[PDB]
Design a binder for this molecule. Structure first.
Ligand code: AR6
Ligand code: MG
Length: 221
């Protein structure tokens, strides 16, 4: 049943999919690149501002090729963004995840998005910070983004959105997590910028929005 639904959905156009959406959606063309958002506006010595967006809101509304889930090792769901993604995708998402046998910290696995306007969900498991991030934490978080981007490339995905992985109940401090997310995407884009149209940082909390906004230029402009 999940296999059948998956094969059916992946054959459909946006136009067809939009007729069965259970919720409202945000089209990719309504999301400004960083380059456009700054249009209304020294240091020692690639422009990548066309390739990235900072977006505040519910990731499950985004009509993009893939959204990324801040999952746990079981891949079976939970709270926070994981819970939101499972509710919005419907029970076929859990069914496909039950066929996957979990996921390691810093790895990623890809599934169909089912009821989501997103074509795919890329599930990744962030590191857990219980008071400090001086173990493998920083590299583990970077690995989440790298592993997700590997699947982006392998699955011909041209638009992808990331939530603030690990900064919820997994407790990673917000500023260092943002530095890692931005640096990882920057480094990947230097080599792969023709591979995608947009990478969207979907922040949820005002705190993360403020952090990301102060850092976008130092990374991409
Ligand atoms: N609808 C949403 N859209 C975008 N971002 C969201 C949304 N809802 C929450 N966030 C943000 O998503 C970000 C991440 O917060 P968290 O969801 O706790 O994920 P973690 O990686 O720290 O913890 C993983 C565990 O949580 C789950 O139970 C899993 O099953 C795992 O067991 C925060 O910035 C949220 O504000
Ligand atoms: Mg490609």
């Amino acid at each position: 049943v999940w296999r059948e639904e998956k094969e059916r959905l992946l054959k459909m156009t946006l136009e067809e999919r939009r007729k069965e959406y259970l919720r409202d959606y945000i089209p990719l063309n309504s999301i400004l690149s960083w380059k456009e958002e700054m249009k209304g506006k020294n240091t020692q010595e690639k422009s990548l501002t066309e390739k990235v967006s900072l977006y505040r809101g519910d990731i499950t509304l985004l009509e993009v090729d893939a959204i990324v889930n801040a999952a746990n090792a079981s891949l079976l769901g939970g709270g926070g963004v994981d819970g939101c993604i499972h509710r919005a995708a419907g029970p076929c998402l859990l069914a496909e995840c039950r066929n996957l046998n979990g996921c390691d910290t810093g790895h990623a696995k890809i599934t169909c998005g089912y009821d989501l306007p997103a074509k795919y969900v890329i599930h990744t498991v962030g590191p857990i910070a219980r008071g400090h991030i001086n173990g493998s934490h920083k590299e583990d978080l970077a690995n989440c983004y790298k592993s997700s981007l590997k699947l982006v490339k392998e699955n011909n995905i041209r638009s992808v959105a990331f939530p603030c992985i690990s900064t919820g109940i997994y407790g990673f401090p917000n500023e260092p997590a943002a530095v890692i997310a931005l640096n990882t995407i920057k480094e990947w884009l230097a080599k792969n910028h023709h591979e995608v149209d947009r990478i969207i940082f979907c922040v949820f909390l005002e705190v993360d929005f403020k952090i990301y906004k102060k850092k976008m230029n130092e990374f991409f402009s």
